[PDB]
Structure formats: C-alpha cells, structure tokens
Amino acid sequence: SKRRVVVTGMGMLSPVGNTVESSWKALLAGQSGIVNIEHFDTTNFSTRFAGLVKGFDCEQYMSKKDARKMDLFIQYGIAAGIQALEDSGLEVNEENAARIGVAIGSGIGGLELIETGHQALIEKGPRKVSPFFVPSTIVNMIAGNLSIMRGLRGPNIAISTACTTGLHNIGHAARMIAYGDADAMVAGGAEKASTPLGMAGFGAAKALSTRNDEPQKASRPWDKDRDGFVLGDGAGIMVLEEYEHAKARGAKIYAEVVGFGMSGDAYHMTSPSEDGSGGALAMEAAMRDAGVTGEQIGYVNAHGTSTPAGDVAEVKGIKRALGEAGTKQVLVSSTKSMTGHLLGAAGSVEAIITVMSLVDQMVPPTINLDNPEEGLGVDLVPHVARKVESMEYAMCNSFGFGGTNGSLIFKRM
Amino acid sequence: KRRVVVTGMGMLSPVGNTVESSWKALLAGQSGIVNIEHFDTTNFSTRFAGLVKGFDCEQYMSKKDARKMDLFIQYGIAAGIQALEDSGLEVNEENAARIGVAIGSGIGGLELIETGHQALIEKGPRKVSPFFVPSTIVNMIAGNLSIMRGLRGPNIAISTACTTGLHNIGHAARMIAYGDADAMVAGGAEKASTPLGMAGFGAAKALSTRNDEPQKASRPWDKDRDGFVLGDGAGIMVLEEYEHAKARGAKIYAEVVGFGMSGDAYHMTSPSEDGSGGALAMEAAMRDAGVTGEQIGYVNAHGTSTPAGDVAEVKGIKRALGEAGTKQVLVSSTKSMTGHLLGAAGSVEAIITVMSLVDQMVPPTINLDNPEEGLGVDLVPHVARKVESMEYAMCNSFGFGGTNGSLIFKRM
C-alpha cells in the first residue's frame, strides 16, 4: 500500500485549558490565558507575565515520587500523551508494542531543574547535584518516559527545533508511519520555559512584549501596537495511526495528515526573511506533498507571534503560497493572541487546533486585533470566531529561531 | 526509489580534527582521553574526558560571531564546513531550497547556560547576554550553518541523547529519499565537558572514576569497566540523492541503505537486559536495507563501557545477525579511544563505519584485556583488523531512555 496517516487521539495542556475540549471551547470564546508570573520575583525582569498552565495535577498520571525525577516540561508532555492515548482507544500489548512509537520533543527542556542543579553545584558542590539531573532535564525524556510508562517499543525520537518542535515531531511521526517503521505514533511537544533564566534569556534578546500593565492585551498579532511575543507553557500531543489499521478497528478519525513541508530562511539567527519566502517554501512543499492548491485551504493557523518583523512577513508568505484566488477564500488567525507562544508546544497545540477547526467547521479568532497594519490583503478573523462551509483542508504554520520552518496540512475526515 | 549516498564528511574528535587524522589515530589504537584542565576538578568524582585539542574557530568565523555561540555550535559548524568543502557541493540560488540541514545535540550549550544563570543570579536579569537563547539551544547548529551557507531546504535538529547523531543522518536520508531535498548536511555535536555536565553525569554515577589512568578508563566489555567516559566533538555527513551526485561528478564514499529505530520501553537509564530493543532497531535497519546477518561485516557498536549496557548489546547483535552472521562479523567500540561523544557519538561513528567500508579495515576495541566470559563475538581487541569483501557495515547508538538506532551503509 501507499500508507495514509490519520489522527485518532489528541491531548493538550495550555494556558486556556487542560484538555483539548476545554482549550478549544475557550479559544472559540476568545479567552486569554495570559497572567502575571507569581511563582518567582519578577522585579527587574523586563517582562513579568506569561501563559501559564493552571491547576496542573501530576498525580492524575503518576506518583509524586516519580514526578520528582522529571522537570515540569516532561510532566506536561506525559500528561498530554496519556490523554491522547486514552482518547485514541488504542490497545498496546506484546503483539504490537514494537509497532507503536513516540516522537516528542521540547525546544529548551528542563530549565527549572537546570537552574536548580546549577545552584546546587555552585552552593553545595558537584556531589550534591541530583542523580536525576540529566534524565530530568534533557529534551528527549518526554519520549523516553512515555515509552517506558506505556510499553511503546516502536521508533523513539525527539525533534528539538525551537518554535517548530511540535509541528516537526508530528510531521516526522507521520513520515515514519507512512514509510512502514510503525503503525502508530504518539507525537508532539511540550515546554515549561517560564522560569527565571527563560524569562531573562528571551528578555535580554528583547523578543518579548513588555506590556506588563495589560498582560491579556500584550499578544496582538498584526496589530499596529504589537511589541514582541508572549511566552507560554504547555503540551500538545497527537496519536497518529496508519489508516487501514484505524479503519479496521473502526477508530474515530479526527483528520488525515496529508502534507508536511519544511524549509530554512537562511537569513538571520532571530528575524525572518523580510520576503516571507522561507515560510512560503515550507507551505508550498506541504501543498505539493498533499496535492492541493491554495483554494482548497480554508484555514491557516499562523505562526503569528506578535512581532513587528515576523507577523507581516508571514502574510507575504501565505499570499505567495496560496495564490490570489486561494488568498481570497482563506481565513487566517493566530491563537497565540490567546495562548501566547508555547515554544516547543506551539506547533503541536496549534496542529490540534487546526484539526478541531476541520472537525467543527469553525475557526478561532485573532483577539486584540484592534488596529491592523494597513494593506494586508487577508481576513485575519479579528475578535470573534468564524464559521466555515465545506472546509476540506486546513494548514498549520510554525516558523522558529534560526529560520527553521514547517507547515502541516490536515484533511477533513 | 531515490537512493542516498555520502559525498562529504567532517569531524572534530578527541583523537583528531579531521576525518583523516581521526581515522588514522583510531586504526593505531590511540586514546584521546585526557585530564580536564579548564576548570577546577578538585571535588569531582570524574576528572577526565575526551577533549577536542587545539580547536581554532577563526578559520570559520570571527571572535565577535563565535561569542554568540556555545562551543557545541562552533564544533558543529566546523565539522559541517569541513563536510561541505569535502563534498564540493555548489550552493546557488537555483538549488538552495533543495539543500537542507539535520543536525542536533544531546544537551546543547551547557557552558553558556551556566554562565547565563550565574549572571542572572549575581547581577540580575539585565546582565544575561542578549544571545543567551540562540547561543545555547540545540537547534542552532542547524540554524547557524544554514544561515552561513545559504541552505534553504528542510532544517531540523533531532535531539535524542546518545543517538542524536545517528538519527539526524538517518532522517536526513529519509527526507532526501522522500523528495524533500536533494542534499542534506547532517549529524551532531556536543561539548558537555563542563562543570554542570561532569557533575550531572557524576551524580547519576554513569561515569568511570578511573582518575589515575584516564586512557584505560574506557574499556567496553572488559571485566573491570566502571561506566562511560565523556567526550566532546562533532561528526557531520553531506548526504545526497544518488543521481544528483553522479551527475555532478561527486566522490561517493558509500550509500546509506538501512535505517532502523526502536525503543527499549524499559528504564530511564539501563537497557533491556535482553538487548531486545537494540535488536529491534538492527532488525529494522536490516529489513530496510534488504540484507541478512552474513552480509554485515562490521558493527560499530554503541559499547559505552557500562556494566549493564555492553553485555546486553552483544545479545542484541547476536539475535539480529543470527548464528552464521555472528560467526563472520567483527564488532568494536571506538568509544574505547574517543569516549562517548553523546550527541556526536552516532555521527562520528557513522563516519568511522563508512571509512571501514572504504579501507576494508576495522578499528579495534582498545583496553579489552579481560573480556566477559561467553560473549560469542570477535570484539577486535587491541589492534585493527583487515577485512575481505565487506559490502555492508552497521553503526549502532542506543541512548538514555531506551531510544535506539542503527544505520547500515553499503560499499560502492
């Protein structure tokens, strides 16, 4: 067979909810998840707010003893992963363990436990660093832990491509299923970089919004007053499955993965091609992969991180990739307006969002879009959700630091 | 079906700063393990490491630019430029979009992470470098090299601890075969020999503590082994679609014919006692390549010099290759000389594996004075070994968490 790949399970922790359903309901209602940071002293930090996961309870998934061996990014990823597996109804036994794998990464990994470990080294010396330091912090250990907990013995990988992480893991999980390495994969990304070193690091690059007096208004993609991105935490995970295998068990199929495209800006360490041409290359490759034209794409969940340079360039890329006719019929929005930029989880969370839009024939809004840049030639779904009619394909973009770009195209099922 | 070949190689390792120098050294059984002198190792339980010697960034970039990059990135860039130049690949406007990068790291920029955190803690948030993020995160070898060389094809970074370098090469090959690119620069780099890195692996007790004889510490399969020896470096390959390479006159070292992956699903730090995870990855690679055990002349093992690890791998190799295959095969761990290069282990060892096909010569497992009894395999103790009509060789990397990979290369 030419092996097709479908989404049969989804799982999510985000600043606007701790399940896919809660998050999606909140997004359709235009709710922000951005709040002040309470868990450390933000006093001389130029940005003091972030998109935080609320009320996270790890004990729902694992013991406090086990959780102590894991940074929160790993706990978040495990939680969304368990959600996704249970949602899929996939059964894992000795017969098929070797055919079920994991592709889950993080952009930065366990910053909090990194900070804690370095503190211990510096205050108490080398012999007082936790024995779990390495496995608690390194980016591949979401995939490691979840495979161990669930007996997943298929391909085990972790892509770490900054803001594109979540998208690339899903894309390559699909590639591996299609190639024959596995019949299912648990795939995505997680991040918890809202720590002192993380906020200072992105602060020092002056990448973040500094609208500290109005956190919920800080993230405003394409708005004339945008001043950098809002950092958020979370996890997004999909169970992907070979189509015949899913059909044969009569699985609920949320969507089909039909295109995955990748490119590099090759421009600058932190700003995008002013062209938007890198983004366009990834979208164009995804479209060719899926065999679709611009008119067939009803929705693009943009990267749209609320940066001056970034937001505008993406619109140029989208127009180039979709063409004139495609551009006229398409809706584009950035849910980062509500969630913030989830970094390693951005791409997987947004892929889930993109799939839900196909499922409900409904597109979430770009909130805070009060005064758009002049001369963008696209409907950016400002303020309020929008219903769509017969949308068969939707696209998710993630365009990260170093110029690493990816797009996924999902098809309605 | 689009075939994939190796047309450029680049390397920084504890035994040399080019592929040729490293290979010559490995064939001569030379160790690159040395005492750490760049920070005070007084209270550290392990005080030695495989270090890159005499690294000079200036032949690739200014001190001003290097300042925006942890050494792991500088190492990766260096091996990447070597590889590109070795390949003779021409990058212009017409083909930039078809040439990509797949390069990762296991841990990334620990030194600049430590430095940044120190600044934050001593001097506050406004004193953290503006380059903190791009200087430390694991995807920025691929980012920086793409920028420096105008590479606009797929840009990824796999970070799978010890299997990183292998997985990046494998997936770069997958992407070429699939049609996403006509060439890829692929591999891994690491420079984790820092205070936090040595303390971190020290606290897990994963390291040899033979501080009195650093060059004897790494002794895969030897009865006295007591954990791995950490090493730094970078290994990079230029991969390219076969027709594209032939059409331009490229020198072709070898063909990538098999890539297999699995997960132990067993424990966060020790392997399936079976070795069955490793076997699954080897078996998948063999099926991908369409070969039997007897067709594999050489396995460059993971063999990190851990008590649990080394033995389990031999079980996996015997299972994957079968009895007849096992009888005709040679197996060695070059980590006996280089140490465990973490994110670079797999890509450096893939280069080694290719060179063994090119020269019909297998490097030794040094320090193998007293092997575990009842391994049923030739582990090439002490001295290099010549081979006859070896058409395929296999490279394994089996990392923390149970993430496994194997690559099979074919002689041209």
Side-chain angles (χ1 to χ4, degrees), chain A residues 3-63 66-67 69-127 129-273 275-373 375-413, chain B residues 2-126 128-326 328-372 374-412:
Chain A
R3 295 158 60 83
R4 292 164 73 184
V5 180
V6 296
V7 181
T8 57
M10 302 196 293
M12 175 178 306
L13 296 176
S14 81
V16 296
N18 292 2
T19 59
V20 177
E21 296 79 355
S22 55
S23 296
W24 178 238
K25 174 166 242 219
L27 292 157
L28 287 183
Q31 290 174 18
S32 169
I34 309 315
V35 292
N36 287 344
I37 289 158
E38 305 289 345
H39 61 282
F40 66 85
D41 180 0
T42 54
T43 285
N44 285 104
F45 289 70
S46 52
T47 297
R48 301 199 307 269
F49 57 92
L52 304 174
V53 169
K54 287 156 207 146
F56 175 63
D57 176 31
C58 70
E59 287 185 335
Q60 184 156 337
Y61 311 102
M62 46 177 136
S63 73
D66 286 0
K69 309 172 183 160
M70 305 177 181
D71 190 88
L72 280 168
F73 89 96
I74 290 165
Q75 300 183 29
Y76 286 4
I78 294 271
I82 300 307
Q83 289 183 25
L85 276 162
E86 294 187 341
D87 183 47
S88 75
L90 191 65
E91 265 189 319
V92 180
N93 54 61
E94 185 186 352
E95 302 306 286
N96 67 5
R99 303 293 299 163
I100 325 258
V102 294
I104 307 172
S106 186
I108 300 180
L111 258 189
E112 174 47 24
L113 291 184
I114 286 170
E115 291 177 42
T116 297
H118 186 239
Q119 195 81 88
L121 168 64
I122 267 190
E123 285 171 12
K124 303 278 166 201
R127 304 180 183 259
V129 170
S130 168
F132 303 108
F133 179 78
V134 174
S136 71
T137 55
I138 62 179
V139 299
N140 79 310
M141 281 306 297
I142 305 155
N145 281 309
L146 186 74
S147 89
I148 294 168
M149 293 174 59
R150 287 275 158 150
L152 315 177
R153 300 201 102 208
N156 179 324
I157 72 162
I159 303 186
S160 183
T161 44
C163 328
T164 310
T165 294
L167 182 159
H168 279 148
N169 280 285
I170 290 176
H172 282 284
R175 290 284 199 256
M176 284 182 274
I177 290 165
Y179 190 83
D181 298 318
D183 298 322
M185 294 292 291
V186 192
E191 205 85 58
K192 208 294 182 185
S194 63
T195 74
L197 195 45
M199 299 302 301
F202 285 109
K206 286 156 186 169
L208 304 181
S209 170
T210 56
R211 197 186 301 274
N212 290 300
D213 62 316
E214 302 172 289
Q216 295 194 307
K217 297 195 188 315
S219 195
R220 50 192 318 96
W222 306 292
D223 180 279
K224 268 163 167 166
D225 302 313
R226 66 195 183 283
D227 71 318
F229 75 85
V230 186
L231 187 148
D233 298 330
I237 299 286
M238 284 184 178
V239 170
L240 301 185
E241 186 171 348
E242 189 272 328
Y243 183 58
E244 295 305 328
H245 182 282
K247 283 199 310 191
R249 69 186 187 93
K252 62 168 167 183
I253 296 178
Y254 292 99
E256 186 182 1
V257 184
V258 292
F260 173 37
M262 289 166 279
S263 77
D265 278 2
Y267 180 57
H268 189 263
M269 184 41 71
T270 52
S271 26
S273 302
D275 287 336
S277 61
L281 288 170
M283 286 177 274
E284 281 160 3
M287 292 166 73
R288 285 198 300 283
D289 191 31
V292 297
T293 66
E295 289 173 69
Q296 303 182 264
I297 287 155
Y299 173 51
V300 184
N301 182 282
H303 186 45
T305 63
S306 205
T307 60
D311 296 356
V312 159
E314 183 167 8
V315 163
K316 292 169 192 209
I318 287 166
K319 290 179 181 158
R320 166 177 153 178
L322 296 184
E324 271 180 19
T327 303
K328 307 319 147 131
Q329 60 81 59
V330 78
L331 303 173
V332 176
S333 71
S334 175
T335 45
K336 299 195 173 62
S337 63
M338 292 170 280
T339 63
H341 185 6
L342 272 39
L343 297 172
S348 52
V349 166
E350 284 161 23
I352 289 166
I353 292 170
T354 302
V355 164
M356 290 306 303
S357 74
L358 283 162
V359 167
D360 286 357
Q361 300 287 293
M362 194 76 166
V363 166
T366 308
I367 72 163
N368 294 320
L369 189 42
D370 304 325
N371 294 125
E373 292 290 347
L376 306 173
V378 310
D379 186 343
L380 297 166
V381 197
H383 302 118
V384 303
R386 189 92 58 77
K387 177 248 176 75
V388 285
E389 294 179 16
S390 314
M391 181 171 72
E392 294 307 302
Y393 301 86
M395 178 176 256
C396 189
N397 292 342
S398 297
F399 298 160
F401 316 119
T404 180
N405 308 310
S407 310
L408 281 170
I409 294 165
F410 293 93
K411 184 177 160 276
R412 189 191 199 183
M413 289 299 274
Chain B
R2 292 160 58 84
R3 292 164 74 186
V4 179
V5 296
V6 180
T7 59
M9 301 195 295
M11 175 176 305
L12 295 176
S13 83
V15 296
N17 292 1
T18 61
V19 176
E20 285 324 292
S21 56
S22 295
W23 179 239
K24 174 169 267 213
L26 292 157
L27 289 182
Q30 289 173 18
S31 171
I33 307 314
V34 69
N35 286 344
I36 288 160
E37 259 111 50
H38 61 279
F39 65 85
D40 182 357
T41 56
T42 284
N43 298 317
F44 287 70
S45 53
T46 298
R47 302 188 206 94
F48 58 90
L51 304 175
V52 169
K53 278 119 204 142
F55 175 61
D56 180 22
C57 74
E58 294 220 300
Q59 50 168 329
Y60 313 105
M61 48 188 301
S62 71
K63 289 174 182 164
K64 188 209 198 200
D65 288 0
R67 151 197 77 106
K68 309 171 183 160
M69 305 178 184
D70 190 88
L71 282 167
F72 89 97
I73 290 164
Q74 299 185 25
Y75 286 6
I77 283 153
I81 287 163
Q82 289 184 23
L84 276 160
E85 292 188 343
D86 181 50
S87 77
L89 191 64
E90 263 190 317
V91 179
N92 54 60
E93 307 277 347
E94 291 55 71
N95 68 4
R98 304 292 298 160
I99 318 210
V101 294
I103 307 172
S105 187
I107 302 179
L110 258 189
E111 175 48 34
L112 289 184
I113 286 170
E114 290 177 40
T115 298
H117 184 238
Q118 194 192 15
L120 168 64
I121 267 190
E122 284 172 12
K123 295 174 171 200
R126 307 167 176 287
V128 171
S129 170
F131 304 108
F132 179 78
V133 173
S135 72
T136 55
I137 61 179
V138 299
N139 77 308
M140 280 304 166
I141 306 154
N144 282 308
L145 185 74
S146 151
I147 293 168
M148 293 175 191
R149 288 275 158 150
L151 314 178
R152 302 200 99 208
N155 179 325
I156 71 162
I158 302 187
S159 183
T160 43
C162 329
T163 311
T164 294
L166 182 158
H167 279 146
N168 279 286
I169 290 177
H171 282 285
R174 290 287 180 80
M175 284 182 274
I176 292 166
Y178 190 86
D180 296 318
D182 299 322
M184 294 291 291
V185 193
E190 204 88 57
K191 208 294 181 186
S193 62
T194 75
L196 195 46
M198 298 301 299
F201 283 111
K205 326 289 180 169
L207 305 182
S208 170
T209 54
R210 197 186 302 272
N211 291 303
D212 62 315
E213 300 176 291
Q215 299 86 16
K216 296 195 187 315
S218 194
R219 52 172 56 242
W221 305 292
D222 184 273
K223 268 164 168 165
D224 305 315
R225 67 195 183 282
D226 72 317
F228 76 83
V229 184
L230 187 147
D232 298 330
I236 298 287
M237 284 183 179
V238 171
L239 301 184
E240 99 177 79
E241 187 273 327
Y242 194 21
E243 293 306 323
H244 181 281
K246 285 182 312 191
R248 69 179 183 87
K251 61 165 165 183
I252 296 177
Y253 293 96
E255 186 180 0
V256 184
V257 293
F259 173 37
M261 289 167 278
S262 76
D264 278 1
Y266 179 58
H267 190 265
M268 56 169 53
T269 51
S270 26
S272 300
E273 298 230 326
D274 290 335
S276 61
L280 288 170
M282 287 177 274
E283 282 161 4
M286 291 167 73
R287 285 197 300 283
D288 191 33
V291 298
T292 65
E294 289 168 68
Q295 303 181 265
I296 288 154
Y298 175 50
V299 184
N300 179 283
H302 186 47
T304 64
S305 208
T306 61
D310 297 355
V311 158
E313 182 166 10
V314 163
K315 292 168 195 242
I317 289 166
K318 289 178 180 159
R319 167 176 155 180
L321 297 184
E323 270 181 291
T326 303
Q328 60 81 59
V329 78
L330 304 173
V331 175
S332 71
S333 175
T334 45
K335 300 195 173 61
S336 63
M337 292 171 280
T338 62
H340 185 8
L341 272 37
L342 298 171
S347 50
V348 167
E349 284 159 23
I351 292 166
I352 292 170
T353 301
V354 163
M355 287 307 304
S356 74
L357 284 162
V358 167
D359 288 356
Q360 299 288 292
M361 195 76 166
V362 166
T365 308
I366 71 164
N367 295 323
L368 189 42
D369 301 324
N370 294 293
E372 291 278 322
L375 306 172
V377 194
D378 188 342
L379 297 167
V380 196
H382 307 299
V383 303
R385 188 91 59 73
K386 185 236 178 75
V387 284
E388 324 251 18
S389 58
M390 183 171 73
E391 293 305 304
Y392 301 85
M394 178 175 256
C395 186
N396 293 342
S397 297
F398 299 160
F400 317 124
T403 180
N404 306 313
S406 310
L407 282 171
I408 295 166
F409 294 94
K410 185 178 161 175
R411 191 191 198 183
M412 290 316 302

